[PDB]
Design a protein. Structure first.
Length: 605
């Protein structure tokens, strides 16, 4: 009952009553050998890294300043949606009841089934291991938008990564007090003595992997995987799934959006948010190096945004994270030079390749290696240019190290969002940029998002939230629409972008990268009320010569902004059937109305 004798750091007595209960009740259940209450200190961090190094769990990267490499079990390398569930009394609160097929907008599990699953996994699960108690805040410590969690885990890798990806340690505990917190429980599911072989010194249990959310109990319970999205419970589980439910209840928004600040040559600054599918491109835009002279781009965050209208009706956003857990492959000086600078210090890498001189390597890194330098792949074999890095391999780096981190990125009141950008991977039919005709149309544009996966398949990913909805997507849509009836709400301009448009030959029509600053300039000007737009059936596009195309030469703007009736007829039809099937009885009136209006404008082409 009393686990005081097994505490190796901190004190049960010093914790708040409800934090003590959570820790102890789970210590009784999981049966850890020790309990380690994290203080978040450098001493704690450095010593835990050194200990993972002793046990072959991580390798130090001698080329850089305090960087580390973990290579995982090939079976445990990404989020598993088919094993990710939300528990509520009624299925319909978690997912809309689909008309004809299976739901693509979430996975419900009953309380009864979950309790059985829990009981078959967690008892004894931490035997012989340390239970780490991680107090963490999501958002700047003083922010009224910030929310506090306690994560218990038996993985040192999760602890170190949480120190980066959240604000972690003693000060969180002192701030929390007798307040409320999200209860976060995680185990890798490998009690000692090990029943099964350990692969690549990476403890996991694929067969029993389960990532569960119980919003009504304020608990996140995750078993069997050590990989980021499944084990860093503050991130997807808390900051999108639980938080989007809380957001709905409390009248704010929790979204899968990057946040950047952009300043023009006359000193005026605006903040924008953007939701793109997990098929990334977010971190690139969030850290964009703008080519346009006199423009500046600074990063507030690259993944998640918690947004709330303030008393003045401004939509205020914070980044609830403390770091960047970005996709490593494809990251280069060319694609994201700001990312390269960030990750050369104090960064934990996972499943990337290692050079013989202790550097990192991945596909699309585009840095020649000196003759003499050989490469060891993420699978721990020598490698010759099978990919040297796993395609979902990662870097985990502090946000404060980004050389263009926004000076207001930790401001407790957040930053005012004046524009919201949706977008996706569309080779055909969708213009480079357009602007929604209204808030209601803008919500429909988010609802309608489609993107080509990596023959090709084009999938729906509404609001970039398909894997992340905390609750019924229809009600989520209703929640977005309600904002139009909030008292002083200054509703931001909604835009949609497609970097991926190809010509007949399969070649990109837009150069992208830092040239995307040119599209951001147009957005900026439209927010200022400029007359730079032309009306089309799908929304406003830049009118003749509105974009700055100087220094690019002859970009084919006709094709790049071409809108075909036959394509868009097909598009609205496909969207109609998707919303009817997947949202069904929960599709709000106003979304059906936007659908009809779009169909109608197209038919008149
Ligand atoms: O869980 C992930 O893989 C993940 C990790 C970091 C940022 N985004 C994602 C995502 O899928 O959107
Ligand atoms: Mn993401
Ligand atoms: Mn309305
Ligand atoms: Na390993």
């Amino acid at each position: 009952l009393d686990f005081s004798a097994k505490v190796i750091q901190g004190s049960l007595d010093s914790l708040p009553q409800e934090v003590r209960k959570f820790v102890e009740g789970n210590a009784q259940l999981c049966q850890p050998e020790y309990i380690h209450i994290c203080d978040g200190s450098e001493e704690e961090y450095g010593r835990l890294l050194a200990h993972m190094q002793e046990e072959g769990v991580i390798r130090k990267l001698k080329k850089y300043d305090n960087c580390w490499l973990a290579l995982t079990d090939p079976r445990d390398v990404a989020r598993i949606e088919s094993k990710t569930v939300i528990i509520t009394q009624e299925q319909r609160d978690t997912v809309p009841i689909p008309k004809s097929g299976q739901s693509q907008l979430g996975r419900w599990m009953s309380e009864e089934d979950f309790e059985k699953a829990f009981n078959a996994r967690f008892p004894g699960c931490m035997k012989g291991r340390t239970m780490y108690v991680i107090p963490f805040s999501m958002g700047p410590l003083g922010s009224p938008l910030a929310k506090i969690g306690i994560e218990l885990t038996d993985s040192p890798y999760v602890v170190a990564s949480m120190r980066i990806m959240t604000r972690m340690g003693t000060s969180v505990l002192e701030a929390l007090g007798d307040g409320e917190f999200i209860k976060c429980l995680h185990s890798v599911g490998c009690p000692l003595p090990l029943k099964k072989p350990l692969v690549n010194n990476w403890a996991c249990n694929p067969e029993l992997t389960l990532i569960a959310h119980l919003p009504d109990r304020r608990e996140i319970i995750s078993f069997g995987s050590g990989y980021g999205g499944n084990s860093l419970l503050g991130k997807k589980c808390f900051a999108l799934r639980i938080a989007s439910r809380l957001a709905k209840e409390e009248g704010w928004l929790a979204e899968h959006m990057l946040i950047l600040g952009i300043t023009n040559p006359e000193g005026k600054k605006k903040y924008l948010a953007a939701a793109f599918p997990s098929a990334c491109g977010k971190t690139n835009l969030a850290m964009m190096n703008p080519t346009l002279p006199g423009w500046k781009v600074e990063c507030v965050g690259d993944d998640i945004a918690w947004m709330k209208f303030d008393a003045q009706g401004n939509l205020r956003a914070i980044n609830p994270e403390n770091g960047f857990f970005g996709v490593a492959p494809g990251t280069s000086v060319k694609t994201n030079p700001n990312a390269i600078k960030t990750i050369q210090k104090n960064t934990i890498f996972t499943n990337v390749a290692e050079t013989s001189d202790g550097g990192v390597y991945w596909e699309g890194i585009d840095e020649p290696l000196a003759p003499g330098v050989t490469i060891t792949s993420w699978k721990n074999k020598e490698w010759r240019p099978e990919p040297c890095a796993h395609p979902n391999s990662r870097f985990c780096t502090p946000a404060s190290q980004c050389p263009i981190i926004d000076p207001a990125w930790e401001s407790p009141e957040g930053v005012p969002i004046e524009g919201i950008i949706f977008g996706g991977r569309r080779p055909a039919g969708v213009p480079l940029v357009y602007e929604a005709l209204s808030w209601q149309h803008g919500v429909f544009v988010g609802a309608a998002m489609r993107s080509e996966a990596t023959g090709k398949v084009i999938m729906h990913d509404p609001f970039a939230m398909r894997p992340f909805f905390g609750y019924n997507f229809g009600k989520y849509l209703a929640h977005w629409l309600s904002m139009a009836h909030r008292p002083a709400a200054k509703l931001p301009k909604i835009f949609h972008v497609n970097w991926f448009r190809k010509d007949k030959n399969g070649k990109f029509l837009w150069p992208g990268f830092g040239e995307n600053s040119r599209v951001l300039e147009w957005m900026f000007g439209r927010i200022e009320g400029e007359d730079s737009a032309k009306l089309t059936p799908i929304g406003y596009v830049p009118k003749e010569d509105a974009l700055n195309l100087k220094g690019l030469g002859d970009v084919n703007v006709e094709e790049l902004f071409g809108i075909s009736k036959e394509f868009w007829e097909k598009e609205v039809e496909e969207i109609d059937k998707y919303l009817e099937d997947q949202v069904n009885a929960d599709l709000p009136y106003e979304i059906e109305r936007e659908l009809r209006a779009l169909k109608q404008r197209i038919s008149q082409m």
